[PDB]
Amino acid sequence: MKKIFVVTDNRTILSDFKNIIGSKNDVQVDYFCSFKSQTSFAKEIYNSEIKPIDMKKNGNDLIGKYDLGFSCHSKQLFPAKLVNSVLCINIHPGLNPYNRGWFPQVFSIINKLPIGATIHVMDEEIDHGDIIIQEEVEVNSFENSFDVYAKVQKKEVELFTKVIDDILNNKFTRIKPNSEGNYNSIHDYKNMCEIDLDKIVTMREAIDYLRAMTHPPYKNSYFIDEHGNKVFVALELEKIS
Amino acid sequence: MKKIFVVTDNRTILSDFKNIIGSKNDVQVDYFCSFKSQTSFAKEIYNSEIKPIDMKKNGNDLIGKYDLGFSCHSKQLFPAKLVNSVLCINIHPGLNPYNRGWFPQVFSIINKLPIGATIHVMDEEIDHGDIIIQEEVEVNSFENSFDVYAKVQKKEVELFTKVIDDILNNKFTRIKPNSEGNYNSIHDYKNMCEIDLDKIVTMREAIDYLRAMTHPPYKNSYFIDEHGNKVFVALELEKI
Numbered sequence: 001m002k003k004i005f006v007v008t009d010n011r012t013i014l015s016d017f018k019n020i021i022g023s024k025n026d027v028q029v030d031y032f033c034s035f036k037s038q039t040s041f042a043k044e045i046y047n048s049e050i051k052p053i054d055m056k057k058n059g060n061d062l063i064g065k066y067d068l069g070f071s072c073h074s075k076q077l078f079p080a081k082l083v084n085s086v087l088c089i090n091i092h093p094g095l096n097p098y099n100r101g102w103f104p105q106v107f108s109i110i111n112k113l114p115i116g117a118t119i120h121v122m123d124e125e126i127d128h129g130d131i132i133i134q135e136e137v138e139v140n141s142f143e144n145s146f147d148v149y150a151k152v153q154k155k156e157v158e159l160f161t162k163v164i165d166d167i168l169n170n171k172f173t174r175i176k177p178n179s180e181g182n183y184n185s186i187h188d189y190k191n192m193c194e195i196d197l198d199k200i201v202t203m204r205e206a207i208d209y210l211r212a213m214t215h216p217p218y219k220n221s222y223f224i225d226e227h228g229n230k231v232f233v234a235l236e237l238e239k240i241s
Numbered sequence: 242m243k244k245i246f247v248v249t250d251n252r253t254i255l256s257d258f259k260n261i262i263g264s265k266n267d268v269q270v271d272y273f274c275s276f277k278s279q280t281s282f283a284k285e286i287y288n289s290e291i292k293p294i295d296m297k298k299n300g301n302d303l304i305g306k307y308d309l310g311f312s313c314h315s316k317q318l319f320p321a322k323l324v325n326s327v328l329c330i331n332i333h334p335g336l337n338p339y340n341r342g343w344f345p346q347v348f349s350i351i352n353k354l355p356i357g358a359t360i361h362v363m364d365e366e367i368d369h370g371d372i373i374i375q376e377e378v379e380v381n382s383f384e385n386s387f388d389v390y391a392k393v394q395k396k397e398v399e400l401f402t403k404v405i406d407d408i409l410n411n412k413f414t415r416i417k418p419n420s421e422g423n424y425n426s427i428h429d430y431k432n433m434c435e436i437d438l439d440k441i442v443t444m445r446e447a448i449d450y451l452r453a454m455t456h457p458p459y460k461n462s463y464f465i466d467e468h469g470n471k472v473f474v475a476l477e478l479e480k481i
């Protein structure tokens with residue numbers, strides 16, 4: 001009777017996991033989310049389908065109570081000794097080791113490194129340890145950050161569905177990542193948000209930039225005009241074929 | 242009793258002109274439209290508030306019956322015999338002589354020549370005769386073609402309200418354009434609509450181009466991608 005914890009701040013992921021994991025024998029599972037997340041998850045917390053936790057403070061208190069941990073779309077990072085003492089697996093919206101860090105799909109639309117989904121064993125470093133399973137996702141011309149994120153998310157759930165048995169059976173793939181690849185900080189993102197009106201680019205590049213920064217309902221890219229107006233920009237694309 | 246004819250394919254222009262002209266004395270006004278609004282105007286047709294006409298063919302059959310002609314957001318050209326037969330005045334959504342012909346505001350957002358409304362006497366050429374009155378409108382950074390056009394169309398009506406009494410009394414300002422300006426044909430406009438993915442531009446330029454091509458509900462600018470899907474693009478801006 002494996003005992004499992006799952007940390008997420010995503011409703012859709014929370015719902016998919018429950019589905020996949022609740023289907024399984026010999027499994028008990030507690031679900032946690034973050035404190036920043038008290039409202040998004042107000043009906044479910046109150047029903048206690050999930051429970052806030054400060055992983056920074058108290059993550060290490062789950063040592064000894066669980067056999068297996070999962071992080072999927074989780075606002076928080078797991079403490080080292082938790083990760084070094086319990087098997088913790090991350091289900092991640094990018095293709096390690098490319099565009100590790102913040103908003104992988106945004107950076108992929110711009111810099112053309114592969115994007116996809118990875119499930120990997122957690123280590124002390126971010127998006128860094130043994131890969132269990134991962135798959136690339138196509139970026140089409142007509143897609144923005146939101147469409148690519150949504151393909152990635154679905155691939156995530158399909159890949160976890162494919163490997164959850166092996167993991168609960170504690171016999172599963174572990175492959176070293178092939179290079180260190182690259183990381184993008186939240187500051188790297190923030191520096192791209194302000195459009196530089198004088199920057200020289202092809203139309204291809206302006207479009208790829210505008211679509212990479214388009215993800216309803218967020219407001220991301222902007223310019224500051226003459227009169228000091230702050231104007232946010234988003235792009236819409238439609239395939240007519 | 243001054244006999245006037247008005248040609249439009251726009252509902253709000255139609256009821257605007259009804260309101261303005263309809264508050265004047267000693268005028269009798271007939272309204273016309275293209276056969277292409279037959280359906281979209283059917284209810285006004287049945288109430289004889291307006292009546293389609295095929296200008297190309299039978300426009301000249303208006304010769305002799307009116308003292309004064311107006312065109313405003315019509316789909317049709319007045320035939321030239323009708324033009325030289327009576328005073329015909331165009332109420333026009335551009336600032337003549339800049340960006341005459343197609344979608345003035347779209348070219349102006351890109352090429353920066355002014356935009357505005359112009360009320361002008363019609364001659365045989367397009368967007369060309371003596372200017373009665375016209376006024377520039379501003380293009381702010383956050384506006385697309387829809388936004389600017391709406392401002393221009395509001396201005397058209399304003400200007401017309403200001404000069405209709407003069408025109409009715411047959412003594413109104415007519416100045417010649419300061420130059421021949423420039424004209425943009427359908428061929429110019431269509432070419433502008435296909436994006437050149439390889440063209441080098443500032444981001445200012447990319448954004449001005451795309452906002453100039455944004456005009457809900459239409460789909461205007463597009464690129465052909467590597468699989469030859471035709472992809473239409475539009476931009477949203479939001480001053481915060």
Ligand SMILES: Cc1cn([C@H]2C[C@H](O)[C@@H](COP(=O)(O)OP(=O)(O)O[C@H]3O[C@H](C)[C@@H](N)[C@H](O)[C@H]3O)O2)c(=O)[nH]c1=O
Nearest residue numbers: 009010073074075103104145149213214215218219220
């Ligand atoms: C905050 C924010 C998000 N987005 C887009 C791009 C992101 O890839 C996507 C989802 O981000 P999110 O914060 O909605 O939701 P998740 O990916 O659901 O978020 C969680 O998992 C991530 C791995 C963590 N880094 C986040 O802290 C955590 O909240 O939404 C934007 O376009 N603009 C934004 O300001």
Ligand SMILES: Cc1cn([C@H]2C[C@H](O)[C@@H](COP(=O)(O)OP(=O)(O)O)O2)c(=O)[nH]c1=O
Nearest residue numbers: 250251314315344386390455456459460461
């Ligand atoms: C027909 C069409 C119009 N437009 C925009 C540009 C034109 O300035 C604007 C107005 O033309 P239109 O809506 O044809 O109506 P009316 O003569 O009643 O105004 O719509 C497009 O952007 N694409 C199109 O295909």
